Symmetry: D3
Subunit: 88 residues, 6 copies
């Protein structure tokens, strides 16, 4: 649960994917589950979005963020198994 890029169980059919805000300019941002991407909501120190998912399945998490005020970007991917953890 200390990882900046992580997820919360919301229900057996819903996963919240998040990335803690590390200070990027973030003119735009997308949070994605298996490359299905939506704009992240910045709340309580993290960019977050909820998706439909199936407990016990494996997923690719992606965070894509605008950086350097027009001059860059970062894309971060991590694989997870969707469990009942609640971290943030």
């Amino acid at each position: 649960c200390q990882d900046d890029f992580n997820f919360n169980y919301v229900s057996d059919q819903e996963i919240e994917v998040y990335h803690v805000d590390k200070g990027w300019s973030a003119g735009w941002n997308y949070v994605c589950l298996n490359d299905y991407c939506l704009p992240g909501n910045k709340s309580n120190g993290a960019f977050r979005k909820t998706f439909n998912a199936v407990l016990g399945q494996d997923y690719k998490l992606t965070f894509k963020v605008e950086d350097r005020y027009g001059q860059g970007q970062q894309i971060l991917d991590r694989n997870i198994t969707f469990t009942t953890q609640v971290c943030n």
Copy 2:
């Protein structure tokens, strides 16, 4: 020169692109200039590689790196103007 992702002047026709080592597992890594990619060498706290370049031109820097033992990765891009800066 405090920026973790940056470049050093090598000569009028060469640029070193680097990213300070942030602790990724880094089973592979690539440093790129305008999407021409080579494996980075880890030296003095950073992943680094040298490319042909032209002083004064603009370039896209990329750093791509394995993390989480191959369960993840990070790709970082930034645009720079190649100057005589040495960090």
Copy 3:
């Protein structure tokens, strides 16, 4: 010149790349020359940006644009030769 995706000569070493506005939500947009990308400025009915270039070379133009208010995107590419054309 009547093509919505095109360029203007600025100097022997400068090209303006533009895409006429086709109505996208366009929360973000990038104009690119050989995958070197910058945010486009929307002016006079087109998204535009100026880049260093070399008269007579061939370039890939790219226009990347946010669409559908968070729910989509479009990426358009075209190859050109940089000439003295002004549209």
Copy 4:
């Protein structure tokens, strides 16, 4: 929601047709995709179309990729939808 040129039809509760109205590209090749699973589109009744397995009520990324300018260009269009019973 049937006006959009980039859209889908219900085929059955387990099958979705994804399509893009033909806008005149050279289209030496084209792909229609569902969640980045891609197949060559068939041009039929003014649109490039293909059918895929899907689950009613799930969210999907639609993609249309097409050649233009005789191989001197291309376009890739993405949009997110929820799979419903609409037939357009």
Copy 5:
């Protein structure tokens, strides 16, 4: 081998809920490799002449297989994709 097993880029049935995706070794330097199912990618294990990994899957569904491999001794790569329907074939 039967026709559906000839191909160097292929899959084995493991169970009704598990698929093994593999690519026979073709000689790449292969400092790194990934095997993927619907763009969920894992580092491949090389065993008995092929790079391989097992995934969750549903018999009868369609999947994109991908194999990504390092090539040219630091100077390149190859990425291969092919679509399959997950069946009970067992090949390698």
Copy 6:
């Protein structure tokens, strides 16, 4: 045929400002193909056993070659990259 000309994915010197990039046919369905130099891509022409296209280049400069090809009869593709230095070799 010397070492630098052996590989199926390679280049020919055409003149001091032109490089031909090619990939020898390896059997793909190949409904479409692209040959690229530094990610500037053109449809390849198939002639004499290889997919090939010419580009502007400068002797002694380093380039990324890419070959992209349709495969599996509508069901896949392959993308190959390699880095080279442009020299006066003539191979195919």
